[PDB]
Write the C-alpha cells for this entry.
Amino acid sequence: GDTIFGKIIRKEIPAKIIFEDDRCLAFHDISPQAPTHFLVIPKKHISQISVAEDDDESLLGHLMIVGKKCAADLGLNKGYRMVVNEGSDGGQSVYHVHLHVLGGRQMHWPPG
Amino acid sequence: ARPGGDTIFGKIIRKEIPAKIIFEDDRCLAFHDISPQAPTHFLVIPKKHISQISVAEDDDESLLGHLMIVGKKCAADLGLNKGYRMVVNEGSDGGQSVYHVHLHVLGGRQMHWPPG
Ligand SMILES: CNc1nc2c(ncn2[C@@H]2O[C@H](COS(=O)(=O)NC(=O)CCc3c[nH]c4ccccc34)[C@@H](O)[C@H]2O)c2nccn12
C-alpha cells in the first residue's frame, strides 16, 4: 500500500483495469513497451518475489493463469512474454510483486 | 514408457540427455541453459508436460507458482544477490523455441528495459 500499486489496488488513482478478483488485479501498464503491455499483481503486499512465502505459491501461479487468460481476451494470439523483475539487476521498478505481460510485436532475445 | 514427453526437456527430465541440474523435486527440475544470455541463466521446468502457458489448466496454478518459488530459491542459492529476471515465453511473438513450459531465470548482470 506504500507503493503506487497499492494506490491502484485501493482505487485511489486511475488505472485501466482489465480484470479483478478477490486476490489479484490486472491493468494496463502506464509506460507500455509493446502494443499490449499489462501487469498482473496480487492484492497481498509481497514486496518482491525473493521474499515470497511457500504458502504464496498458488497465488503466484494464479497471477500467471490470470495473465494468460487476459492475454487471450486481449487477442494476443501470436503469443507474448511474461516477466517478473527482482532487485536492481532485475530492473524491478516497484516493490510490489508484479507480472508483466507483453505482446502485439515480436519479442527479441536476449530479454534485456 | 516416457513421462515428461519427447521434447528435449522431457529427455532431460528422464536423464536421457545430459544437463547441469541445480535442483530437482517431484514437480520440477532446474538446470542451466545451454545458450546463456546472462552470467547466470537457468531454466525451471515442470515434470508434468504442459506445452505452453496458453494451454495450462486452472489446476496447474500451484505447479506454475512452484516454478517461481523454486526459481527464486535457486537464484538465492546461486548467489544472485543483486537480483534477476524471470521470463516465460509463449508462442512465436514470445520466441518460444521448445513447447514444454519453462521459466527462464537470468542474472549476474544489469538487465535492460524493454525485456526484448
Ligand atoms: C539445457 N540444455 C539444453 N537446452 C536447450 C536445448 N535446445 C534449446 N535449449 C534451451 O531452451 C531454451 C528455450 O527457451 S525458449 O523456448 O523460450 N526460446 C528461446 O530461447 C529462443 C528465443 C529467441 C527469439 N528470437 C531469437 C533469435 C535468436 C536466438 C534466439 C531467439 C533456450 O534458452 C535454449 O537455449 C538443448 N539441446 C540439448 C540440450 N539442451
